[PDB]
Structure 1
Amino acid sequence: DRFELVSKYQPQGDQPKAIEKLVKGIQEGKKHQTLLGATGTGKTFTVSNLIKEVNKPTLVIAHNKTLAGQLYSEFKEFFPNNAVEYFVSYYDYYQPEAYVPQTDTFIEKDASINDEIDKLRHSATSALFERRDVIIIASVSCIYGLGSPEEYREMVVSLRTEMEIERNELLRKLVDIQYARNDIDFQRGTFRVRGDVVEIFPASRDEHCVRVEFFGDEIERIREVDALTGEILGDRDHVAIFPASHFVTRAEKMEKAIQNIEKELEEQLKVMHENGKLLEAQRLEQRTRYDLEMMREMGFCSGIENYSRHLTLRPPGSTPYTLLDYFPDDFMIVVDESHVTIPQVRGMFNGDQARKQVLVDHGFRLPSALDNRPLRFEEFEKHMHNIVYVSATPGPYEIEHTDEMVEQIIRPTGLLDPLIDVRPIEGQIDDLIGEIQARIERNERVLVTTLTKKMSEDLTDYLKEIGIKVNYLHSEIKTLERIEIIRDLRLGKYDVLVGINLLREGLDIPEVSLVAILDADKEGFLRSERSLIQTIGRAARNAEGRVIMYADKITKSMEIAINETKRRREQQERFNEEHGITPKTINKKERQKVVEQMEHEMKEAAKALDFERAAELRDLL
């Protein structure tokens, strides 16, 4: 079951040494290790190599789904013959259930499920039971509730050729595991029957189904077929069909769980009446007994997840089953951007618990709803066999638990850490204009970080008044719109981006030759050692990259950041000299509303692939 790493690359720079150390670290049974890779060193190639050498099922955790998608695309290319999988929340958008006591307003759960994401989730969990050569790229969705892997495993329908089994008995088993008969619209999670042929569309597929051909009570053949075409893709001697749902509640357990929910309700109502929580008792009882009628009628009610722990018949406070449980005991976790991802993982339970206690306090939910929850960080720790944190700036968790850092500081094409200049706060804006103007003449772009909304808007406005092409990265710009703006910077539609936080997803672009840091000496979050080094990093994608920090004094964070930058650049230039390498970059209000409408139109015409209409609109613009 080996990983086969496919790439146009060979390990370069100090990648071989980083790989060596990390592999030896796992051989030494080191639970925690940290890969201290400076930005642009190819840390994802390093991890690919680690994954190949250690050869365990591996979980890669990422802090946003844009980066998770980005890792997934890359790992599929790296391991085309192994099972690279994607595990993210299937919600296209998610408004959780919430209550605002201040305004006495309840927020209903609002959300739509993405069919492709649910598919990839099913593909992920079934793979863990089919083979060892599995890499999953996941969000913190990996610490959220899933049915019992033992049950999921156990509920598989196994079929093999020459097997005895009745056609209709197969139908019954498939229903029992949440497949639906649909002869007319045959989709995933669905079976269709034509005489002696059953076609099952696995929940893990939207592309290929399993055709099972009977002769009497015996399977003659099993074929992977193209669902739409009927074109045979291959014969199988064996197929495992996994449940179409990650939480199936058979009719027997549901009856009992309804027993237990009623009793819990009966006890909570008692306690609330004694404490004169009359409103909250009325509300809770209406809601719960309605939920309970629906379960008795349909075996389903909306927001049924609030009852997950009851439906399992497990005692209160029980750790949820998560994806972590689907993995063998001997698996590896890689935590991408660990300084961000680790605090996020810890923050999920507490955010969840806070939101749900205001619902239990005010009678919208039973206390058992809190058992429908992500893992506690102490629970996530229990799943750590070998964990490798990946970060240019490791957090205090990683630092504490790692005996020695594995450093990786050398870039494939020899690109250096930028030159840093410290310049006074006085004459700040004017000094910067000059540096921007000079970058404009050179067909290079600029990133600039301000501490405030106020300075960002003032400087953006002033730049615009001057004839400079600029965009303010406002904080409430979503990453989808962010990426559009960044694409436009790359194109030279803008020459400068001004933002408070430049550490937001996707801001590493080769065309940027200058990063300017206003108020570098104000510490806080924005001017911490971590923020400074990451911000410096944005200038390291360009062979003439440079940072300017405006500051009247050198704070502790400036010192560590400037020191580390200068130290790496030194070793990097030594490597380059010693290896014969030359660093090379890898690669008016009325007008305003008209442009925003035609742009939307141009973008719509592009999604529709009416590229001619999108051209007409670009030329209009």
Structure 2
Amino acid sequence: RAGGHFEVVSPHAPAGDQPAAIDELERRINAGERDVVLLGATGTGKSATTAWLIERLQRPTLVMAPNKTLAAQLANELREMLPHNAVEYFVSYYDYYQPEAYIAQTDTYIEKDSSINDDVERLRHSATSALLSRRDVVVVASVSCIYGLGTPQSYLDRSVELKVGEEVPRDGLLRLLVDVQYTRNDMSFTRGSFRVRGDTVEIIPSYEELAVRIEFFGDEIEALYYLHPLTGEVIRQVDSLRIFPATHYVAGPERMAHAVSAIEEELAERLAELESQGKLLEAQRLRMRTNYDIEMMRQVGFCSGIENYSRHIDGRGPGTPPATLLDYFPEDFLLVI
């Protein structure tokens, strides 16, 4: 995690309680205080104090807010004070979301339905990449953060970097693009997708807004270039760049194998459980749904309900905390709630 210094551009002049408060909070955190409280009255500007504390500590910060409403107004403001560091975002990426719900009394299956937002997931993946690519990363998170996730381990593993001049098989590059959830959209150009024409390859990464054109000298990386996605305007050129998986359900083929194994084992477990319960209808419905799900893992590796198998994918045990953006954070990560 390469942590660039949190360059603070604050034309405001701190006064009143700001200096003493920041100093005492700083020494508080220095004192190993795993539990701290702040009394910030209205108009006291908690955002600036949090930014300065993050600057002093130089740790990847996770800030916790209770509703997506709040996150918006603050994160943009901090970017003004931090125009040279990774400022990020994460909340529920759902314009709408009915859960997988079950009216037991009526035996009614209100199936999980969701109108999926785009920019929310974009910023989610940008945040995960930034955390697993640099230490100067600040992320605003809804409680969703503590829900089940994939492993930042595999997140950083599946990611692959390419540099100008280095020999690299283009076909292997496409293979790893597929393995990191990027589609060979040879028809049009879309987010997290890409197209191949001759040695030329043009890709929009899922987290990175812009696109990139790579020219190939046979099976060698001829050159890399930033781009506007559709117009293709080369923003600039850099020798090397990394790509992270477009999914947070990152998992090597071996991790998919282990997840499938544990899924089948706990599937037998739940089969016996519902058989004893006498809930044969529910048992069979779950059985066939997960049968289709595992079929299209063994074929594709992608579907709905993948999260429900996080304990298998992450591989940790039942009842333990599933993977989290906290794992995406270091142990010396800054935390604010």
Say yes or no: TM over 0.5: yes
Equivalent of 1:192, from 192, 195, 202? 195
The aligned counterpart of 1:307 is 309
- 3-state SS of 1:130 partner: coil
Give the letter aligned to residue 215 of structure 1: F
1:387-420 Cα offsets, whole Å, 9 max, x none, are xxxxxxxxxxxxxxxxxxxxxxxxxxxxxxxxxx
Structure 2 segments unaligned to the other structure (5+ residues): none
The aligned counterpart of 1:233 is 235
Output the CA distance in 2 between the equivalents of 1:297 and 1:174: 17
Give the letter aligned to residue 312 of structure 2: H
The aligned counterpart of 1:54 is 57
Equivalent of 1:243, from 242, 245, 262? 245
Matching of residues 444-523 of structure 1 within 5 Å? none
- Cα gap change, 1:162/1:290 in structure 2, threshold over 3 Å: closer, same or farther? closer
Asked whether the 8 Å contact 1:26–1:54 carries over to 2, the reply is no
The aligned counterpart of 1:160 is 163
- 3-state SS of 1:266 partner: helix
Give the letter aligned to residue 54 of structure 1: L
Output the CA distance in 1 between the equivalents of 2:285 and 2:222: 58
Equivalent of 1:175, from 175, 178, 196? 178
Report whether the alignment pairs 1:130 with 2:133.
yes
Output the CA distance in 2 between the equivalents of 1:202 and 1:334: 30
Give the letter aligned to residue 166 of structure 1: P
**Segment of structure 1 superposing worse, 79-88 or 228-237:** 228-237
**Segment of structure 1 superposing worse, 276-285 or 83-92:** 276-285
- 3-state SS of 2:52 partner: helix
Give the letter aligned to residue 203 of structure 1: S
Distance apart, 1:292 and its partner CA: 3.9
The aligned counterpart of 1:483 is none
Give the letter aligned to residue 7 of structure 2: E
Asked whether the 8 Å contact 1:71–1:137 carries over to 2, the reply is no
Give the letter aligned to residue 47 of structure 2: T
1:230-287 Cα offsets, whole Å, 9 max, x none, are 2222221221111111113455554554444344333433344445444444444444
- Cα gap change, 1:299/1:129 in structure 2, threshold over 3 Å: closer, same or farther? closer
The aligned counterpart of 1:38 is 41
Distance apart, 1:63 and its partner CA: 0.8
The aligned counterpart of 2:217 is 215
- 3-state SS of 2:36 partner: strand
Report whether the alignment pairs 1:105 with 2:105.
no
Q: How many residues align?
A: 334
- 3-state SS of 1:37 partner: coil
Output the CA distance in 2 between the equivalents of 1:170 and 1:309: 30
Asked whether the 8 Å contact 2:151–2:250 carries over to 1, the reply is no
- Cα gap change, 1:184/1:57 in structure 2, threshold over 3 Å: closer, same or farther? same
Asked whether the 8 Å contact 1:91–1:114 carries over to 2, the reply is yes
Equivalent of 1:326, from 325, 328, 332? 328
- 3-state SS of 1:193 partner: strand
The aligned counterpart of 2:271 is 269
Structure 1 segments unaligned to the other structure (5+ residues): 336-621
1:451-485 Cα offsets, whole Å, 9 max, x none, are xxxxxxxxxxxxxxxxxxxxxxxxxxxxxxxxxxx
The aligned counterpart of 1:86 is 89
Give the letter aligned to residue 39 of structure 1: T
Distance apart, 1:102 and its partner CA: 3.0
Distance apart, 1:103 and its partner CA: 3.1
Query: Higher RCO, 1 or 2 (CA under 8 Å, sep at least 6)?
Result: 2
TM-score w.r.t. length of structure 1 = 0.51
Higher helix share: 1
Q: Sequence identity, in percent?
A: 59
Asked whether the 8 Å contact 2:274–2:283 carries over to 1, the reply is yes
Distance apart, 1:307 and its partner CA: 2.3
Output the CA distance in 2 between the equivalents of 1:261 and 1:22: 46
Distance apart, 1:317 and its partner CA: 2.6
- Cα gap change, 1:300/1:177 in structure 2, threshold over 3 Å: closer, same or farther? closer
Output the CA distance in 2 between the equivalents of 1:279 and 1:227: 49
Distance apart, 1:72 and its partner CA: 0.9
The aligned counterpart of 1:73 is 76
Distance apart, 1:127 and its partner CA: 0.8
Output the CA distance in 2 between the equivalents of 1:43 and 1:255: 47
- 3-state SS of 1:154 partner: helix
Output the CA distance in 1 between the equivalents of 2:244 and 2:318: 28
Output the CA distance in 2 between the equivalents of 1:281 and 1:332: 44
Output the CA distance in 1 between the equivalents of 2:268 and 2:70: 47
Output the CA distance in 2 between the equivalents of 1:277 and 1:228: 53
Output the CA distance in 2 between the equivalents of 1:263 and 1:133: 41
TM-score w.r.t. length of structure 2 = 0.90
Output the CA distance in 2 between the equivalents of 1:120 and 1:329: 22
- Cα gap change, 1:267/1:52 in structure 2, threshold over 3 Å: closer, same or farther? closer
- Cα gap change, 1:161/1:10 in structure 2, threshold over 3 Å: closer, same or farther? same
Distance apart, 1:134 and its partner CA: 1.4
